[PDB]
Amino acid sequence: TLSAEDKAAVERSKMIDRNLREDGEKAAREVKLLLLGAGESGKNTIVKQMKITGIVETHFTFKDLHFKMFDVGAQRSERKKWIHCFEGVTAIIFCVALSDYDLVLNRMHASMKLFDSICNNKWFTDTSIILFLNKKDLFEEKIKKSPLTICYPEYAGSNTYEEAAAYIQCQFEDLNKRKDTKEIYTHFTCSTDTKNVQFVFDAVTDVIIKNNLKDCGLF
Amino acid sequence: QLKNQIRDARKACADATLSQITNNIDPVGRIQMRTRRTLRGHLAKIYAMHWGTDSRLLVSASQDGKLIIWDSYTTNKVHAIPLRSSWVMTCAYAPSGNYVACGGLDNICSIYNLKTREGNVRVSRELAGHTGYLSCCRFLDDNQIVTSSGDTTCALWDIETGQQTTTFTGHTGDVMSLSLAPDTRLFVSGACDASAKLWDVREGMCRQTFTGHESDINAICFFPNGNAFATGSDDATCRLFDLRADQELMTYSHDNIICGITSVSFSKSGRLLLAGYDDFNCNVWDALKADRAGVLAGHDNRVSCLGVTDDGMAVATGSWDSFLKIWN
Amino acid sequence: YQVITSLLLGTLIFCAVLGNACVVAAIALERSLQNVANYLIGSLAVTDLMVSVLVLPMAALYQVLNKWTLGQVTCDLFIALDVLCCTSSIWHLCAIALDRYWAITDPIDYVNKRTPRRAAALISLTWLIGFLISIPPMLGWPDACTISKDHGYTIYSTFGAFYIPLLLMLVLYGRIFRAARFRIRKKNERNAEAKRKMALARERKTVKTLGIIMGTFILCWLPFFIVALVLPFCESSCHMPTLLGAIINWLGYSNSLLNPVIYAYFNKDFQNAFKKII
Amino acid sequence: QLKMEANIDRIKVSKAAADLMAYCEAHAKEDPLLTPVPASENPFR
Ligand SMILES: C/C=C\C/C=C\C/C=C/C/C=C/CCCC(=O)O[C@H](COC(=O)CCCCCCCCCCCCC)COP(=O)(O)O[C@H]1[C@H](O)[C@@H](O)[C@H](OP(=O)(O)O)[C@@H](O)[C@H]1O
Ligand SMILES: CC(C)CCC[C@@H](C)[C@H]1CC[C@H]2[C@@H]3CC=C4C[C@@H](O)CC[C@]4(C)[C@H]3CC[C@]12C
Ligand SMILES: CC(C)CCC[C@@H](C)[C@H]1CC[C@H]2[C@@H]3CC=C4C[C@@H](O)CC[C@]4(C)[C@H]3CC[C@]12C
Ligand SMILES: CC(C)CCC[C@@H](C)[C@H]1CC[C@H]2[C@@H]3CC=C4C[C@@H](O)CC[C@]4(C)[C@H]3CC[C@]12C
Ligand SMILES: CC(C)CCC[C@@H](C)[C@H]1CC[C@H]2[C@@H]3CC=C4C[C@@H](O)CC[C@]4(C)[C@H]3CC[C@]12C
Ligand SMILES: CC(C)CCC[C@@H](C)[C@H]1CC[C@H]2[C@@H]3CC=C4C[C@@H](O)CC[C@]4(C)[C@H]3CC[C@]12C
Ligand SMILES: CC(C)CCC[C@@H](C)[C@H]1CC[C@H]2[C@@H]3CC=C4C[C@@H](O)CC[C@]4(C)[C@H]3CC[C@]12C
Ligand SMILES: CC(C)CCC[C@@H](C)[C@H]1CC[C@H]2[C@@H]3CC=C4C[C@@H](O)CC[C@]4(C)[C@H]3CC[C@]12C
Ligand SMILES: CC(C)CCC[C@@H](C)[C@H]1CC[C@H]2[C@@H]3CC=C4C[C@@H](O)CC[C@]4(C)[C@H]3CC[C@]12C
Ligand SMILES: CC(C)CCC[C@@H](C)[C@H]1CC[C@H]2[C@@H]3CC=C4C[C@@H](O)CC[C@]4(C)[C@H]3CC[C@]12C
Numbered sequence: 032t033l034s035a036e037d038k039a040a041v042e043r044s045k046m047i048d049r050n051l052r053e054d055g056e057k058a059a060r061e062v063k064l065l066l067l068g069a070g071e072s073g074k075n076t077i078v079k080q081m082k083i084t085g086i087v088e089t090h091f092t093f094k095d096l097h098f099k100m101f102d103v104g105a106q107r108s109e110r111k112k113w114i115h116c117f118e119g120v121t122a123i124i125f126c127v128a129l130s131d132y133d134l135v136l137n138r139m140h141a142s143m144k145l146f147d148s149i150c151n152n153k154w155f156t157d158t159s160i161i162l163f164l165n166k167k168d169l170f171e172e173k174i175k176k177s178p179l180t181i182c183y184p185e186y187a188g189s190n191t192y193e194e195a196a197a198y199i200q201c202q203f204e205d206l207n208k209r210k211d212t213k214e215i216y217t218h219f220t221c222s223t224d225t226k227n228v229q230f231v232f233d234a235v236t237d238v239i240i241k242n243n244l245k246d247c248g249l250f
Numbered sequence: 251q252l253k254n255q256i257r258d259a260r261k262a263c264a265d266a267t268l269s270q271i272t273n274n275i276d277p278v279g280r281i282q283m284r285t286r287r288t289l290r291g292h293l294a295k296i297y298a299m300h301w302g303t304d305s306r307l308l309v310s311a312s313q314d315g316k317l318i319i320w321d322s323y324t325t326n327k328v329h330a331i332p333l334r335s336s337w338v339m340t341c342a343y344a345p346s347g348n349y350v351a352c353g354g355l356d357n358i359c360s361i362y363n364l365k366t367r368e369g370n371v372r373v374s375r376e377l378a379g380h381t382g383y384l385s386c387c388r389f390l391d392d393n394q395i396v397t398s399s400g401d402t403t404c405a406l407w408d409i410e411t412g413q414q415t416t417t418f419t420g421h422t423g424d425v426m427s428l429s430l431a432p433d434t435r436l437f438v439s440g441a442c443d444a445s446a447k448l449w450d451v452r453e454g455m456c457r458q459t460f461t462g463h464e465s466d467i468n469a470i471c472f473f474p475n476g477n478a479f480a481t482g483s484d485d486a487t488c489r490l491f492d493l494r495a496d497q498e499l500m501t502y503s504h505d506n507i508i509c510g511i512t513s514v515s516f517s518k519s520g521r522l523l524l525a526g527y528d529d530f531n532c533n534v535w536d537a538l539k540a541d542r543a544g545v546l547a548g549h550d551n552r553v554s555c556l557g558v559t560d561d562g563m564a565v566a567t568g569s570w571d572s573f574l575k576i577w578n
Numbered sequence: 579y580q581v582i583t584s585l586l587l588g589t590l591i592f593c594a595v596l597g598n599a600c601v602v603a604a605i606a607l608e609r610s611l612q613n614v615a616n617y618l619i620g621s622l623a624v625t626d627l628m629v630s631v632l633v634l635p636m637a638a639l640y641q642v643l644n645k646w647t648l649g650q651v652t653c654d655l656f657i658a659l660d661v662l663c664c665t666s667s668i669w670h671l672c673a674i675a676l677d678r679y680w681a682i683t684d685p686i687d688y689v690n691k692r693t694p695r696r697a698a699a700l701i702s703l704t705w706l707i708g709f710l711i712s713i714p715p716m717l718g719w720p721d722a723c724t725i726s727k728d729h730g731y732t733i734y735s736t737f738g739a740f741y742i743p744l745l746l747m748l749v750l751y752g753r754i755f756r757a758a759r760f761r762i763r764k765k766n767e768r769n770a771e772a773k774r775k776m777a778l779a780r781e782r783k784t785v786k787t788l789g790i791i792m793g794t795f796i797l798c799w800l801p802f803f804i805v806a807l808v809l810p811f812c813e814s815s816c817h818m819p820t821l822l823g824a825i826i827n828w829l830g831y832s833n834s835l836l837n838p839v840i841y842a843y844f845n846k847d848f849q850n851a852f853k854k855i856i
Numbered sequence: 857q858l859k860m861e862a863n864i865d866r867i868k869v870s871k872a873a874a875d876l877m878a879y880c881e882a883h884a885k886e887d888p889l890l891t892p893v894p895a896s897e898n899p900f901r
């Protein structure tokens with residue numbers, strides 16, 4: 032009991048615990064987002080337009096709210112053994128390019144499969160998904176120059192841009208199996224910069240409000 | 251043809267199993283253990299833990315970017331090193347208690363120095379030569395380290411120079427776990443190919459390949475004798491492989507477990523081994539009778555790591571709940 | 579006659595004590611229930627336990643014996659403690675409602691400033707109000723043990739303990755209902771029908787939750803305060819039946835065990851915590 | 857690679873099992889996890 036070194040060690044442990052708790056409290060007020068997509072879906076351009084060799088961390092500050100965006104597509108490996116580490120993320124931002132008919136690895140089916148795997152993952156039951164679509168001008172030019180039956184053997188319809196976009200929107204939102212827990216927010220990415228950040232902020236706020244309501248039991 | 255010859259050689263040499271020889275051996279009984287101490291310092295999931303050579307200081311790394319070195323006697327905190335990357339997958343402690351390595355999703359497991367004249371933790375080395383997420387980097391001596399990454403390669407790095415001296419390749423899937431033998435002359439690496447390969451550090455070319463699993467293998471630990479090891483897989487069927495015999499000896503399976511394993515450890519004498527499953531329970535199984543000698547509870551989500559001291563006094567197990575339980 | 583009432587009161591007190599103790603133990607013994615809302619719920623459970631341990635036995639003894647035989651000092655202490663604890667419970671309910679309002683209608687504040695210190699401040703404010711309206715009778719101002727019937731004291735207590743928090747809670751919950759309905763409202767035919775059905779189910783769930791939360795307070799507390807406000811102002815008409823007076827008086831005390839049942843035992847996480855404890 | 861790996865000096869499986877049992881029994885007296893350590897000499901109490 033009457034030990035000076037033991038008391039000094041206890042004081043050091045108390046100081047370390049205080050510092051750790053303070054740092055945890057400081058870092059707890061940060062909304063985490065997980066950015067996912069294909070290799071060349073415009074993820075880098077999207078990060079650039081918001082901000083203006085493995086995990087890439089990006090910091091955003093909009094209307095007094097700190098967002099930590101984690102881009103993971105830099106490195107390719109087995110997703111089954113590190114996806115679980117991203118449990119609890121506020122939202123998953125999935126990026127898709129509309130003008131993917133030209134090059135065949137076909138990318139549309141692969142993107143659908145990836146989205147289905149991510150959305151139905153057992154570790155993201157309560158995680159919301161925000162869907163971004165890129166390169167509308169290229170998509171419009173391609174539909175003007177090429178039909179839609181090439182990518183969709185089992186679909187026939189008009190070539191109007193709005194109808195095709197709505198069909199793709201509905202198809203993407205159709206993949207999810209569970210609809211009561213998670214809601215998919217889909218937005219069209221454009222050359223503007225403020226609209227994307229505003230939509231991300233609105234989606235995060237809606238998700239937080241819905242989670243709070245569910246905790247209260249109203250929702 | 252050569253694989254067929256190896257299969258014939260291994261099947262011909264097998265006439266009886268370890269079960270028959272262990273029939274006359276009485277059971278170890280019910281080994282009941284209780285959590286003597288509880289360490290609650292982290293605020294997120296802990297993914298690794300390593301015991302020191304003195305069985306006093308152990309280092310654990312969490313997902314909040316913090317690794318903490320605790321005094322296992324008084325449950326006091328002596329070092330807490332903040333990290334640039336919040337994602338940490340593995341940690342390792344030096345035999346001499348001077349350097350601590352921690353790595354994760356980023357293609358670097360940083361080595362930090364504990365003993366310094368100024369008395370403050372500072373960055374010592376940052377090895378960056380891999381392209382896949384680092385799985386486990388282990389210390390051999392004061393000047394060498396091994397790294398098992400997600401690129402399907404095992405790299406031998408020199409801390410002083412910082413460049414890799416030897417590279418091991420041949421795995422199709424990413425390697426997950428790596429353990430060092432007591433003599434620090436050879437090790438074993440496992441990957442998603444449901445197989446384990448022995449690698450000799452001095453020369454740097456493979457010796458043997460062992461199969462028997464159907465899913466990915468997550469943990470591998472040498473027997474204290476150094477002539478055999480145990481591997482865990484997601485099929486809930488841990489298997490012990492002998493290097494000298496080059497064939498599986500016995501199977502460790504039970505009908506009440508359907509979930510996978512996370513870590514496998516041995517005892518000082520090897521009579522009883524420890525397995526961490528996803529049922530927030532630790533299983534203590536007899537290494538000879540192939541029976542369940544003990545069940546340990548007290549975890550909520552999932553057991554992430556477990557380790558026995560070199561002296562064999564106690565065993566520390568850590569789960570995703572952020573509580574480390576010391577059974578003795 | 580006496581035996582039945584005594585047994586019923588004892589069973590009620592035992593059930594309330596068991597519920598409050600179970601809530602407190604579940605909150606304390608587990609690390610997954612350490613939240614500001616859970617802290618407020620635990621404070622409410624502690625107040626209910628205090629009511630059950632200190633005030634309820636005295637009231638039961640007075641009711642069964644039909645007279646007070648513990649002295650004037652003990653009667654004054656009982657009255658003060660009962661008033662203080664009932665006010666504490668009501669204001670804890672109001673504080674929980676206000677915290678829910680802040681959480682739902684302010685996401686930025688929820689993310690940034692949701693430290694436990696806010697719960698401590700709210701609890702301190704509620705206890706301060708309780709002491710403020712409970713001390714005056716001892717500081718400022720034979721067999722029967724009854725509260726003072728002064729017009730000023732009774733109006734002050736009624737308006738500062740029930741009516742003001744009642745109106746505040748009503749306004750807060752109306753705003754919550756408005757916000758929740760706004761959020762909910764905000765081959766394709768099948769999808770539209772499914773969405774409409776889900777929205778209707780969510781609206782029904784919200785309506786049921788609000789109705790239960792409001793009723794368990796109104797129908798359990800309003801009659802007692804109305805009686806306490808009307809009786810002192812009508813000295814000519816004091817022929818209120820004993821049975822109805824007793825039932826109205828004991829409804830508020832019985833409310834002590836419904837609050838933990840509704841606020842705590844209902845939400846999924848807390849019952850899962852119980853199941854883990856078992 | 858397989859050509860060099862195949863040429864190894866292999867032993868009998870039963871011999872390896874016997875060696876493992878002998879090693880396990882030799883050090884069975886120094887296992888705190890197996891034999892409950894009394895609190896007197898236990899530094900974890
Ligand atoms: C108009 C026509 C006529 C119809 C009109 C007249 C009659 C209408 C009556 C309608 C029914 C109303 C009661 C609702 C019952 C009910 O719905 O419960 C169901 C199952 O639960 C149990 O039954 C199990 C509950 C058991 C709780 C434990 C009780 C025993 C503990 C004793 C204490 C001592 C123990 C030691 C479904 O559960 P739930 O929907 O009620 O659950 C919700 C609850 O209602 C919300 O309040 C709550 O919000 P919060 O509390 O404010 O934070 C939500 O989070 C959620 O928990
Ligand atoms: C559960 C523990 C902690 C608290 C006990 C609360 C209740 C059950 C206890 C507290 C005091 C008790 C009362 C004390 C005095 C008498 C007077 C006697 O003539 C009949 C019984 C009666 C009326 C008792 C019945 C039960 C009682 C009301
Ligand atoms: C009569 C007294 C002395 C003994 C019984 C006290 C307690 C256990 C009783 C009194 C009234 C009961 C409640 C009355 C209404 C409901 C609503 C229903 O949907 C779930 C059960 C619930 C919540 C009951 C649970 C048990 C309860 C709280
Ligand atoms: C005599 C009557 C009024 C009953 C009073 C019981 C009160 C004083 C007791 C019952 C259980 C106790 C709590 C049990 C658990 C803990 C958790 C600990 O980390 C801090 C203290 C705290 C929060 C205790 C404080 C006091 C407490 C709330
Ligand atoms: C049975 C348990 C659970 C609760 C205890 C109930 C009874 C016995 C307790 C509660 C509060 C106590 C009183 C508290 C204050 C005083 C004032 C003092 O000047 C004389 C005794 C007196 C009047 C005490 C007598 C016993 C008492 C009435
Ligand atoms: C980690 C920290 C911040 C958690 C905060 C919990 C605090 C707000 C809670 C836990 C239990 C509560 C106490 C429980 C019992 C009593 C006794 C009563 O006569 C006065 C209030 C008092 C003293 C409460 C005040 C607030 C309290 C201390
Ligand atoms: C006469 C004196 C005491 C003033 C009383 C004013 C009360 C009755 C008023 C003030 C605010 C009102 C509420 C404001 C918001 C809504 C939400 C709406 O969707 C249903 C009605 C409801 C719930 C109102 C009901 C009545 C209300 C509670
Ligand atoms: C003193 C105590 C025992 C009285 C408790 C009575 C409670 C249970 C009564 C009072 C008013 C009732 C509510 C009145 C209105 C509705 C709206 C309806 O769409 C669903 C039921 C619901 C939500 C009722 C459920 C039960 C209710 C809350
Ligand atoms: C929810 C609350 C506010 C309802 C209150 C209802 C009260 C005011 C009602 C219910 C029954 C009524 C009593 C019923 C019987 C009589 C007997 C008669 O000879 C004088 C009046 C008297 C004594 C009534 C006075 C008012 C009374 C007590
Ligand atoms: C369990 C709770 C939450 C709801 C139901 C409580 C009811 C059934 C209980 C609680 C206490 C009981 C009262 C206790 C005391 C008396 C006084 C006596 O002279 C007549 C009966 C009367 C008036 C009882 C009638 C029923 C009663 C009012």
Ligand SMILES: CC(C)CCC[C@@H](C)[C@H]1CC[C@H]2[C@@H]3CC=C4C[C@@H](O)CC[C@]4(C)[C@H]3CC[C@]12C
Binds near residue numbers: 600849852853856
């Ligand atoms: C003094 C202590 C030891 C007594 C402990 C008794 C506890 C375990 C009892 C009392 C009431 C019980 C609960 C009452 C009702 C429900 C709701 C149901 O849908 C799931 C079980 C659950 C949540 C029960 C679980 C166990 C429970 C919490």
Ligand SMILES: CCCCCCCCCCCCCCCC(=O)O
Binds near residue numbers: 602603606631
């Ligand atoms: C005679 C009055 C009886 C009152 C009974 C109240 C029971 C309170 C139970 C509190 C349990 C607190 C558990 C603390 C656990 C810990 O040691 O940390």
Ligand SMILES: CCCCCCCCCCCCCCCC(=O)O
Binds near residue numbers: 695698699701702705
């Ligand atoms: C009789 C009622 C006493 C009230 C006791 C309240 C004790 C609060 C404990 C938490 C202390 C944290 C500091 C709170 C500062 C504050 O008052 O706002």
Ligand SMILES: CCCCCCCCCCCCCCCC(=O)O
Binds near residue numbers: 788789793796801
């Ligand atoms: C003694 C006073 C009796 C009158 C008080 C009755 C209170 C009943 C509670 C009704 C809850 C209404 C819930 C909101 C309904 C709505 O959506 O408008």
